[PDB]
Design an enzyme around this catalytic site. Structure first.
Site, PDB file in Angstrom:
ATOM      1  N   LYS A  41       0.823  -1.214   0.000  1.00 43.60           N
ATOM      2  CA  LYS A  41       0.000   0.000   0.000  1.00 43.60           C
ATOM      3  C   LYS A  41       0.858   1.266   0.000  1.00 43.60           C
ATOM      4  CE  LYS A  41      -0.884   0.147   5.034  1.00 43.60           C
ATOM      5  NZ  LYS A  41      -1.816   0.595   6.107  1.00 43.60           N
ATOM      6  N   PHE A 122      23.715  -3.842  23.270  1.00 49.01           N
ATOM      7  CA  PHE A 122      22.274  -3.661  23.204  1.00 49.01           C
ATOM      8  C   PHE A 122      21.647  -4.364  24.396  1.00 49.01           C
ATOM      9  CE2 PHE A 122      20.619  -1.239  19.762  1.00 49.01           C
ATOM     10  CZ  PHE A 122      19.236  -1.389  19.764  1.00 49.01           C
ATOM     11  N   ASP A 224      -3.139  -4.953   8.984  1.00 47.93           N
ATOM     12  CA  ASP A 224      -3.928  -5.325   7.810  1.00 47.93           C
ATOM     13  C   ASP A 224      -3.904  -6.816   7.428  1.00 47.93           C
ATOM     14  OD1 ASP A 224      -3.362  -2.171   5.988  1.00 47.93           O
ATOM     15  OD2 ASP A 224      -4.525  -2.651   7.773  1.00 47.93           O
ATOM     16  N   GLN A 243       4.977  -4.815  22.917  1.00 48.79           N
ATOM     17  CA  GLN A 243       6.227  -4.258  23.420  1.00 48.79           C
ATOM     18  C   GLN A 243       6.139  -2.759  23.643  1.00 48.79           C
ATOM     19  OE1 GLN A 243      10.363  -4.462  21.357  1.00 48.79           O
ATOM     20  NE2 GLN A 243      10.551  -5.648  23.261  1.00 48.79           N
ATOM     21  N   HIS A 245       8.484  -0.020  24.168  1.00 50.25           N
ATOM     22  CA  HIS A 245       9.850   0.475  24.118  1.00 50.25           C
ATOM     23  C   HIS A 245      10.066   1.504  25.223  1.00 50.25           C
ATOM     24  CE1 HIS A 245      13.733   1.129  22.059  1.00 50.25           C
ATOM     25  NE2 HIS A 245      13.612   2.350  22.546  1.00 50.25           N
ATOM     26  N   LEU A 255      10.624   7.398  18.250  1.00 51.32           N
ATOM     27  CA  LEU A 255      11.584   6.521  18.902  1.00 51.32           C
ATOM     28  C   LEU A 255      12.976   7.114  19.007  1.00 51.32           C
ATOM     29  CD1 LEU A 255      12.032   3.235  19.620  1.00 51.32           C
ATOM     30  CD2 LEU A 255      13.668   3.676  17.807  1.00 51.32           C
ATOM     31  N   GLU A 258      17.526   2.344  21.418  1.00 48.97           N
ATOM     32  CA  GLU A 258      18.121   1.679  22.579  1.00 48.97           C
ATOM     33  C   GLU A 258      19.643   1.719  22.478  1.00 48.97           C
ATOM     34  OE1 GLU A 258      15.992  -1.555  24.365  1.00 48.97           O
ATOM     35  OE2 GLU A 258      17.741  -2.864  24.257  1.00 48.97           O
ATOM     36  N   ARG A 289      13.563  -4.890  27.575  1.00 50.06           N
ATOM     37  CA  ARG A 289      12.640  -3.805  27.289  1.00 50.06           C
ATOM     38  C   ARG A 289      11.480  -3.800  28.276  1.00 50.06           C
ATOM     39  NH1 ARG A 289      14.816  -1.978  21.966  1.00 50.06           N
ATOM     40  NH2 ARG A 289      14.032  -3.468  20.416  1.00 50.06           N
ATOM     41  N   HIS A 356       5.530  -0.053  20.811  1.00 47.61           N
ATOM     42  CA  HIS A 356       6.606  -0.132  19.839  1.00 47.61           C
ATOM     43  C   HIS A 356       6.480  -1.311  18.873  1.00 47.61           C
ATOM     44  CE1 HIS A 356      10.791   0.396  18.429  1.00 47.61           C
ATOM     45  NE2 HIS A 356      10.799  -0.923  18.402  1.00 47.61           N
ATOM     46  N   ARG A 400      10.459  -9.329  23.042  1.00 48.39           N
ATOM     47  CA  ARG A 400      11.393  -9.304  21.932  1.00 48.39           C
ATOM     48  C   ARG A 400      12.679  -8.572  22.295  1.00 48.39           C
ATOM     49  NH1 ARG A 400      11.568  -4.904  18.898  1.00 48.39           N
ATOM     50  NH2 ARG A 400      13.346  -4.979  17.440  1.00 48.39           N
ATOM     51  N   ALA A 403      17.049  -5.309  18.587  1.00 49.43           N
ATOM     52  CA  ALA A 403      17.779  -5.585  17.336  1.00 49.43           C
ATOM     53  C   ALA A 403      17.520  -6.979  16.748  1.00 49.43           C
ATOM     54  CB  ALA A 403      19.277  -5.340  17.512  1.00 49.43           C
TER      55      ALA A 403
END
Ligand SMILES: *Cc1cc2c(cc1C)nc1c(=O)[nH]c(=O)nc-1n2C[C@H](O)[C@H](O)[C@H](O)COP(=O)(O)OP(=O)(O)OC[C@H]1O[C@@H](n2cnc3c(N)ncnc32)[C@H](O)[C@@H]1O
Ligand code: HEM
Ligand SMILES: c1ccc2[nH]c(-c3cscn3)nc2c1
Ligand SMILES: O=C([O-])CC(=O)C(=O)O
Ligand code: SF4
Ligand code: F3S
Ligand code: FES
Lengths: 613, 240, 102, 139
Positions: A41, A122, A224, A243, A245, A255, A258, A289, A356, A400, A403
């Site tokens: 889209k 991270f 969707d 999540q 963030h 955002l 991180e 997170r 997030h 999650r 990265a």
């Protein structure tokens, strides 16, 4: 009625999505010799992955020495053991091959003294299976990793003869007897309706973060594909796992990576205490997170709120060398100014935990094959695949890891293509569809195109958003979830009081944002009911009333001398949600997590444990 | 305490027989709005008029979706904060000298097809060994890419170059051109000579007359012109 | 790779520096050779200059080829006349001198 | 599967067969010093080439030598400040195009191509134009 001209198309495959996942899958198929259509889209570049900042995980060992198996450990641990270990095996192993493929494609990664791909620290990543200290394996194109990634992939995609349907809005899957035959889509450019049919279909539509009032995601994160699957009477998985963030701008909720923290960033409350050193003594503000944003949200309750309204927190960067801030974090430095008027060299950014990422999505193989749940057992849905945030092979589980989505994208995009290549031949019999097929999608289209009711799309969307925001936040209680549940269900009813104003064929962004609302509703409805049912605290989903990890055992002490709880007596299982479209009634089921890896010898199964950072 | 701003906005319905390109005015209490011009556009869409049609997505300025003429200059609506000065009426237009599909939504198919013609992907003479090892590139060789790789194909530049206005078919334009240069100075790329050799006609590169509107307007603070100059130099001095 | 374009471009800059040098040179040395070299440089740079304006605005095969033809004629007529004036008249260095004291 | 070249053709065949408007350009684009100084270079460029061309062609088409043509000009009311002015507007175009031409060559080397360095250079070119056009109309 038959006011709409139907144009029919024939292919070997169709990919719905042009994000990381979408594209990788798309030309992956072309490369394997498949006459492929890709439906999106947005213009591929506009896809949400472009916003991605931090980086992409691979155990390449450029900073120190690494083992992909340590990456494996990190991921399953972070997933709070709702993560399917077969899929995590496949992913974390394929990681270096996948990043290298990207670099070889042209992705301009930041570089080390060796002139190898630069990696950085991270959140929640370790060496030697959670022992040997902080791991530096996040590969990045400075601050604009997702940007580069998407363009690199897009660039590369031009190399093959994929037939692209740009600015086409997929409406539903073409379903005939539990088998996927293709898609039906609206051509935004002229309003005409298209039946693209293929032997195989990939859904890579990304998340549905827009179900919330405040989220880091794009205005096009409208679930969707999830909805398309829901409308097919197929299950969506683990949707209550959303999540939050830790670090997003107080204002527009953009955002801030991180990677800020992995580069030495610190989190500060109203009285200056590095509150994260107290909340997670070992890892600090480079924890998970779900832990970090849990701590942030809590500090606000505590009273240690920052700013005029005492309703945010400060991410500090000013103590870092300015050379490092310019090189390692340019993208945020600029938008910290643009959206907050903040010079990163001299003052802290106003941050707040915001929505997030969508862990849950469409249930999937490690092969990317979409699953249904027949007789308490799994079943491959013929001609149907899903990858990216849209999907849920739950390689991410309950929480999650930072990265890992960019990794997810490329790994499973590729996986989908390989699964098709290795199961069937290009130019094989494309399964035929009924002349009537997609009928109701067009009927649904028409009704929305001429909607006259009491409530206007934007009003209703804002109702759903503020409700999800206040009843399905960081912390949730059965009472608030209960109110939210019926609150949303009532709002689902309101969908037949819709007011549309635009009535044209060309670029009717009034109508699509309404189709997007139908889609978001289903996503929210399943998110909230699933949330109310899960009476435990696993990963991102934290219950105030049930703050305990509910497993088949009590893994705080060794097993055996313990009696194993039966399936519907513990909570360590995947939430499978459905919805009767007409009524809006959610019904839930459950399937077990996978614990066997792809080879015990190559990669040991990591049994559940106490999870602390 | 109210505070109202005016917005003059280009409109065109292809679905309203014999509609002519005209402006339409709206009024917004800036107290009920985010700082950016997009915030406003969305707010009038959501409340005052949803016949208003524009592209948007990231509301952050990385997707390159906004891309519209705002008060004479081409920027990103999600990046540009409106003039708190209530005495001025804000003028919003579609990207200049482009075919309007509807309202502020321009047909970019050419802009895209032109980008495809430069082959914006790494190319090796021997690609039998690809997908095995990460290629080597020094932090130095890498620096030559800064200010280049950041382009979000927003098209503000190309669509403010008057040479592109008169020669949009055959002249490639700043964004697309700068990208060819982005692949030229990529150390890992092997086809540098043949990339240049493709700009060997009067129109592709040589319609640029250093007008410098491109660099002037880039919302991302990039310098397409300077890169075009560098191509021109490479063209004159490369060998064969 | 018949480098027609990139040659034409440098050639333009070569006459552009040349034409700049010949201005103070002519004033500091108003000889007859300086009249001819100033005529060549002048009409060349001018012919390539308008040549750009032509390709920029003149659309089609009909018009663009015609405009080039008519420009080449105008240029030839302009160079010949300046050579004539150098030969059978004052010479452009002295023609400027005479014109200026006035 | 479609070529970049194939896409371009379809873009033209579709849009030329449509009733779509072109968005306004010069009529709405906000003017800046360099933007104006670019056409001025075309102006002065075209104007000068016309001057040189008119000179060369009249030198072939018109009879009577240059000396007699000058005397023809003297044969007229030539106010010291009206011979100055009629001459200043003959240097002015040349001096601008001369100075700005130099700037164009510095650009061709690649120098001074930032936005600050462009307003600085443009103004300097603009000043020098005046000084040399007044310092030559007085010569
Ligand atoms: C919000 C966010 C997420 C993010 C991040 C920074 C921000 C601000 N940084 C990340 C990072 O540094 N590292 C990482 O691993 N992940 C990061 N994330 C999360 C991640 O970027 C996303 O989850 C991921 O990019 C999702 O990508 P995916 O390929 O799944 O798709 P998408 O980019 O979200 O875009 C969706 C595509 O699908 C098409 N689409 C959607 N709906 C339709 C319909 N109805 N019809 C046809 N096509 C559709 C879109 O066109 C789009 O291309
Ligand atoms: C010695 C002083 C002069 C210098 C250094 C000079 C240099 C230049 C330069 C650098 C350009 C633009 C090329 C570009 O876009 O990069 C130009 C334009 C042009 N010049 Fe000159 N020039 C000088 C005097 C003249 C004279 C006396 C004439 C008359 C014959 C002339 C005719 C033109 C024409 C016709 C153009 C084209 C305008 C355009 O396309 O932008 N120039 N000049
Ligand atoms: C506005 C409109 C048309 C313009 N054309 C130029 C130009 C042509 S050659 C050097 N500059 N500059 C312009 C500015
Ligand atoms: O989802 C992610 O990986 C990340 C993210 O916010 C970032 O650090 O850019
Ligand atoms: S160079 Fe700048 S203005 Fe041009 S397309 Fe790229 S980001 Fe947009
Ligand atoms: S606006 Fe223009 S002609 Fe060249 S320097 Fe920039 S592309
Ligand atoms: S919408 Fe992403 S550029 Fe403004």
């Amino acid at each position: 009625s038959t006011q709409y001209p139907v144009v029919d198309h024939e292919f070997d495959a169709v990919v719905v999505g042009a994000g990381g996942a979408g594209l990788r899958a798309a030309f992956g198929l072309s490369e394997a010799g498949f006459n492929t259509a890709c439906v999106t889209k947005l213009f591929p570049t506009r896809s949400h992955t472009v916003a991605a900042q931090g980086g992409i995980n691979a155990a390449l060992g450029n900073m120190e020495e690494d083992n992909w198996r340590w990456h494996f450990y990190d991921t399953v641990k972070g997933s709070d053991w709702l993560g399917d270990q077969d899929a995590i095996h496949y992913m974390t192993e394929q990681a270096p091959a996948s990043v290298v493929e990207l670099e070889n494609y042209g992705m301009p990664f930041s570089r080390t003294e060796d002139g190898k791909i630069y990696q950085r620290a991270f959140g929640g990543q370790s060496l030697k299976f959670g022992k040997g200290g902080q791991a530096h394996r996040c590969c990045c194109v400075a601050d604009r990793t997702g940007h580069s990634l998407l363009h690199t992939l897009y660039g590369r995609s031009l190399r093959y003869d994929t037939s692209y349907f740009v600015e086409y809005f997929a409406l539903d899957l073409l379903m005939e007897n539990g088998e996927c035959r293709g898609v039906i889509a609206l051509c935004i450019e002229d309003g005409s309706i298209h039946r693209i049919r293929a032997r195989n279909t990939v859904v890579a539509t990304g998340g549905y973060g827009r179900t919330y009032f405040s989220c880091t995601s794009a205005h096009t994160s409208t679930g969707d594909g999830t909805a398309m699957v829901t409308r097919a009477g197929l299950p969506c998985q683990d949707l209550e796992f959303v999540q939050f963030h830790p670090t997003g701008i107080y204002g527009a909720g953009c955002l801030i990576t991180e990677g800020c923290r992995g580069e030495g960033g610190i989190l500060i409350n109203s009285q200056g205490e590095r509150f994260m050193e107290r909340y997670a003594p070992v890892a600090k503000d480079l924890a998970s997170r779900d832990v970090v944003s849990r701590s942030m949200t809590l500090e606000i309750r505590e009273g240690r709120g920052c700013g005029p309204e005492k309703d945010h927190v400060y991410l500090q960067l000013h103590h870092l060398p300015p050379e490092q801030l310019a090189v390692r974090l340019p993208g945020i430095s600029e938008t910290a100014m643009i959206f907050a008027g903040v010079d990163v060299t001299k003052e802290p950014i106003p941050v707040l935990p915001t929505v997030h990422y969508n862990m849950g999505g469409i249930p999937t193989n490690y092969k990317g094959q979409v699953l249904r749940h027949v007789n308490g057992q799994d079943q491959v849905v013929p001609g149907l695949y899903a990858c990216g945030e849209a999907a849920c092979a739950s390689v991410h589980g309950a929480n999650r890891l930072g990265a890992n989505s960019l990794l997810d994208l490329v790994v499973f995009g590729r996986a989908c293509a390989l699964s098709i290549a290795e199961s069937c031949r290009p130019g094989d019999k494309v399964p035929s569809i009924k002349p009537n097929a997609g009928e109701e999608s067009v009927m649904n289209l028409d009704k929305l195109r001429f909607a006259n009711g009491t409530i206007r799309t934007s009003e209703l969307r804002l109702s759903m958003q503020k409700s999800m925001q206040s009843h399905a936040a960081v912390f949730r209680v059965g009472s608030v979830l209960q109110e939210g549940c019926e609150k949303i269900l009532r709002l689902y009813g309101d969908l037949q009081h819709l007011k549309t104003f635009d009535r044209g064929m060309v670029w009717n962004t009034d109508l699509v944002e309404t189709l997007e609302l139908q889609n978001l509703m289903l996503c929210a409805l399943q998110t909230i009911y699933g949330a109310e049912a899960r009476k435990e605290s696993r990963g991102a989903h934290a219950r105030e009333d049930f703050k305990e990890r509910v497993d088949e055992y009590d893994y705080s002490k060794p097993i055996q001398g313990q009696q194993k709880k039966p399936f519907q007596e513990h909570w360590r299982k995947h939430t499978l949600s459905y919805v009767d479209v007409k009524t809006g009634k959610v019904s839930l089921e459950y399937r077990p997590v996978i614990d066997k890896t792809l080879n015990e010898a190559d990669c040991a199964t990591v049994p559940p444990a106490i999870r602390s950072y | 305490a109210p505070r109202i701003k005016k917005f003059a906005i280009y409109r065109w319905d292809p679905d309203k027989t014999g509609d002519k390109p005209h402006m339409q005015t709206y009024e917004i209490d800036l107290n009920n709005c985010g700082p950016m011009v997009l915030d406003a556009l969305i707010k009038i869409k959501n409340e005052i008029d949803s016949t208003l049609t524009f592209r948007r997505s990231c509301r952050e300025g990385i997707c390159g979706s906004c891309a519209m003429n705002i008060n004479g200059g081409n920027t990103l609506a999600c990046t540009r904060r409106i003039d708190t000065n209530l005495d001025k009426v804000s003028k919003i237009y579609p990207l200049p000298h482009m075919y309007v599909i509807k309202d502020l939504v321009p047909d970019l198919s050419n802009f895209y097809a032109q980008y495809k013609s430069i082959e914006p992907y790494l190319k090796k003479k021997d690609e039998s060994q690809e997908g095995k090892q990460q290629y080597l590139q020094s932090i130095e060789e890498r620096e030559k890419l800064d200010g280049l790789y950041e382009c979000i194909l927003c098209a503000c530049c190309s669509t403010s170059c008057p040479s592109y206005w008169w020669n949009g078919d055959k002249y490639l334009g700043p964004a697309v051109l700068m990208q060819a240069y982005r692949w030229m100075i990529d150390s890992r790329d092997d086809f540098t000579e043949e990339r240049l050799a493709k700009l060997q006609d009067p129109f592709s590169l040589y319609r640029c007359h250093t007008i410098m509107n491109c660099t002037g307007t880039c919302p991302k603070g990039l310098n397409p012109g300077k890169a075009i100059a560098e191509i021109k130099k490479m063209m004159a001095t490369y060998k064969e | 790779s018949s480098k027609a374009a990139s040659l034409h471009w440098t050639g333009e800059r070569v006459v552009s520096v040349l034409l700049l040098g010949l201005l103070p040179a002519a004033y500091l040395n108003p000889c007859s050779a300086m009249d001819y070299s100033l005529a060549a440089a002048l009409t060349l740079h001018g012919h390539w200059g308008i040549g750009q304006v032509v390709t920029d605005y003149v659309r089609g095969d009909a018009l663009q080829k015609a405009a080039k033809a008519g420009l080449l004629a105008l240029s030839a007529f302009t160079f010949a006349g300046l050579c004539y004036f150098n030969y059978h008249d004052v010479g452009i260095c002295k023609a400027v001198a005479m014109l200026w004291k006035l | 599967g479609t070529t970049a070249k194939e896409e371009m053709e379809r873009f033209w065949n579709k849009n030329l067969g449509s009733n779509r408007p072109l968005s306004p350009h010069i009529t709405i684009y906000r003017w800046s010093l360099p933007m104006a100084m670019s056409i001025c270079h075309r102006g002065t460029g075209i104007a000068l080439s016309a001057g040189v061309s008119l000179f060369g062609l009249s030198a072939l088409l018109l009879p009577g030598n240059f000396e007699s043509h000058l005397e023809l000009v003297k044969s007229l009311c030539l106010g010291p400040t009206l011979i100055y002015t009629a001459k200043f507007g003959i240097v002015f175009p040349l001096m601008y195009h001369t100075w700005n031409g130099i700037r164009h060559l510095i650009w061709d080397l690649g120098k001074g191509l930032t936005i600050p360095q462009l307003t600085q250079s443009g103004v300097v070119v603009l000043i020098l134009t005046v000084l040399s056009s007044v310092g030559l109309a007085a010569m």
